[PDB]
Amino acid sequence: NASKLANTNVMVVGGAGFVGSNLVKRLLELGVNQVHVVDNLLSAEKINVPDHPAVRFSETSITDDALLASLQDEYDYVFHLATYHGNQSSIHDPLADHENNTLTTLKLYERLKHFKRLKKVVYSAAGEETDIVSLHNNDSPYSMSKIFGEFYSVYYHKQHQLPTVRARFQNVYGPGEILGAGRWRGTPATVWRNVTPTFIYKALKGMPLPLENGGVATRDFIFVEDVANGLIACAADGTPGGVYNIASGKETSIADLATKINEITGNNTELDRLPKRPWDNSKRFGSPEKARRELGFSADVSIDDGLRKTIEWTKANLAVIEQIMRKHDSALATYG
Amino acid sequence: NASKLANTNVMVVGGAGFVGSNLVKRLLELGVNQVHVVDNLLSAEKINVPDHPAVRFSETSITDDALLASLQDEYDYVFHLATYHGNQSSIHDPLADHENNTLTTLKLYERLKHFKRLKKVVYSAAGEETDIVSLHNNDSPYSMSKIFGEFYSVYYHKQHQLPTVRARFQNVYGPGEILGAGRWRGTPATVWRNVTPTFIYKALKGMPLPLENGGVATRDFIFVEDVANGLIACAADGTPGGVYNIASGKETSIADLATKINEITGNNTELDRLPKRPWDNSKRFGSPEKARRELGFSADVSIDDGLRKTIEWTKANLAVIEQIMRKHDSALATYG
Ligand SMILES: NC(=O)C1=CN([C@@H]2O[C@H](COP(=O)(O)OP(=O)(O)OC[C@H]3O[C@@H](n4cnc5c(N)ncnc54)[C@H](O)[C@@H]3O)[C@@H](O)[C@H]2O)C=CC1
Numbered sequence A, B: 001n002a003s004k005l006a007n008t009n010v011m012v013v014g015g016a017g018f019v020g021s022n023l024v025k026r027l028l029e030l031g032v033n034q035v036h037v038v039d040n041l042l043s044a045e046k047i048n049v050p051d052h053p054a055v056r057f058s059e060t061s062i063t064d065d066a067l068l069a070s071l072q073d074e075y076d077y078v079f080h081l082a083t084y085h086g087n088q089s090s091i092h093d094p095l096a097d098h099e100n101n102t103l104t105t106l107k108l109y110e111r112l113k114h115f116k117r118l119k120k121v122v123y124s125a126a127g128e129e130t131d132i133v134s135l136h137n138n139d140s141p142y143s144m145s146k147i148f149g150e151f152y153s154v155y156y157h158k159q160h161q162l163p164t165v166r167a168r169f170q171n172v173y174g175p176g177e178i179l180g181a182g183r184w185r186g187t188p189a190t191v192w193r194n195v196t197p198t199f200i201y202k203a204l205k206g207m208p209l210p211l212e213n214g215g216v217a218t219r220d221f222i223f224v225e226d227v228a229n230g231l232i233a234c235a236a237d238g239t240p241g242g243v244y245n246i247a248s249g250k251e252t253s254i255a256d257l258a259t260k261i262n263e264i265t266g267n268n269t270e271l272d273r274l275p276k277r278p279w280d281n282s283k284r285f286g287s288p289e290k291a292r293r294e295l296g297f298s299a300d301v302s303i304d305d306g307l308r309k310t311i312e313w314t315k316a317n318l319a320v321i322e323q324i325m326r327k328h329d330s331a332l333a334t335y336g
């Protein structure tokens, strides 16, 4: 963690997004001097970027040449969270993915490489830590772009001493993830972004939660405020050139996720759940041990507590979320 | 190999370059129906693209949107040889590298992905074959771009059945590599492209050949006509989704390279050579066994025979080469 961030100047690329908006909130709580949010709103809503005396917002792509040339060596920390959201959208259009997922990292790093005030540049990568990768089983252009940004992070550190730290995480959930956020990116996943907000929304509407294959799939969910603190710990204390898993270390099946959401929301509809078998998940989830040992970081928000917090926020904001989702009604109808 | 290529339509992206020009010559010998060379001449000379009834030349980047949209499903084979030449230039300007080394592959594959006449798409990658890669020890943006094109090759095959074959090679030498070819790409390596043509040129001029560290470094040199035949064997018979080393399997030290070039040219000047020790090369060169077994391909041109052929060509073309090199005199003078 740290008050190492108190009174500092920070840039959050992708800072209007789900993880980004939460990181910005936490940085302001820690008393940073300035946050420069650079976000084109491609998969985000402007209501997630506060109008705050300490927040500067550039509604602009990080690949923009003018914006890049305008940047000054006035930042202590940079968090690079931009992506092309997400797997499905990237498959639909690999060139839209490349512009907003691969080239973003390269152009940013190229601009930052001779900056001297920078203490750390933290890159959100996809989830002990190894730096060996296979050419196979990269299911999407998104997955490749995330790996490519790790390659860039290592290169700019070795060649130009850019103080990069790669933070690998997965299955983040919590307040601030808005179904339908941003522009239509090609597929229904623009609306139905991820399983948790989908289930919470449908449960709040009293609808049956669709389980694929009885919900035997397991995931290591992590609450977004823990991810924000993990990213801050990487910034403050992560080793330049290094990589850390930011992970809960706890697996929850989709069936149990749905069960919990139904019980918290009062959704009395049926669940077509099946018993998990040894072949259903035969594999790898990230160990949280390195971050615990080196950074003193642990993601301790339980799936029960994180879900209550998320549902509370979703309830309070349901009308706003519904209006955002509805902008895609026509695209949703045309799809396929 | 094959007459599988007789009477076919072929595209050679990067076909005005060193390996590309040699491949085009060999394809015409094998009686292809048409060769479409797409080359922006960034590191090539127009004199390497013949004015032939069977050759169409598009002096255009493969990333050009209009060019890409204009392409028709009229190709049996595509060879993707374009790159940003080379390591040093890419370090000087990673964004010039990305445009001409990473984005080239993605935009090409995106255009080709629904073409139905395609039998094989052969990608020149950098050098038994494994598909595991490290984030470390990628010394340049060039090296990363070459690996990224392997990622793309695997993805487009799995997702869209694009019939890709990755051909890994290194240390190609021979006729058609012109010192100073193309535009100034930032550094003296635009002129002094590689050790072999550098040594041949200097030897022909009666100059001492500079050895770094007594020339203890070893390389697996491969003659360019063998590489052209290797690429053709990949096209004809390589497994879609697969990868093959196109390699000589024989190591030559830089000292022996220089010795041979001096002896063939009659260069009587001194050589500051040192004995090779076990720590000088402690590592990995590609095994040629898979290509031998699956494709019936072996690169059998010896370093002695290939060097004679290369020197003969360089002598015959020295005036033309000198004029090409001289275009960079001013840039060379300003450098650093
Ligand atoms: N949410 C999750 O479970 C996981 C997230 N990640 C990574 O975390 C980071 C944040 O992702 P989320 O907040 O979940 O998604 P998000 O889509 O809410 O956030 C990404 C932000 O990037 C912005 N953006 C897109 N293109 C841009 C460009 N050219 N210039 C500037 N900004 C741009 C979007 O408008 C959006 O605000 C991403 O890098 C993502 O790959 C990694 C693993 C898991």
Ligand SMILES: NC(=O)C1=CN([C@@H]2O[C@H](COP(=O)(O)OP(=O)(O)OC[C@H]3O[C@@H](n4cnc5c(N)ncnc54)[C@H](O)[C@@H]3O)[C@@H](O)[C@H]2O)C=CC1
Pocket (backbone or CB within 6 Å): B013, B014, B015, B016, B017, B018, B019, B020, B038, B039, B040, B041, B042, B043, B044, B060, B061, B062, B063, B080, B081, B082, B083, B084, B085, B099, B100, B101, B104, B124, B125, B126, B127, B146, B169, B170, B171, B172, B173, B182
């Ligand atoms: N020569 C060697 O020892 C090795 C070569 N390679 C690979 O072999 C391929 C051929 O390389 P060489 O012939 O040695 O170099 P080269 O520089 O002579 O050939 C590359 C060609 O690509 C063209 N080009 C550059 N940007 C382009 C763009 N946007 N669109 C179209 N064409 C473009 C250049 O003008 C040049 O004619 C490259 O992919 C290279 O990475 C791989 C390992 C070793």
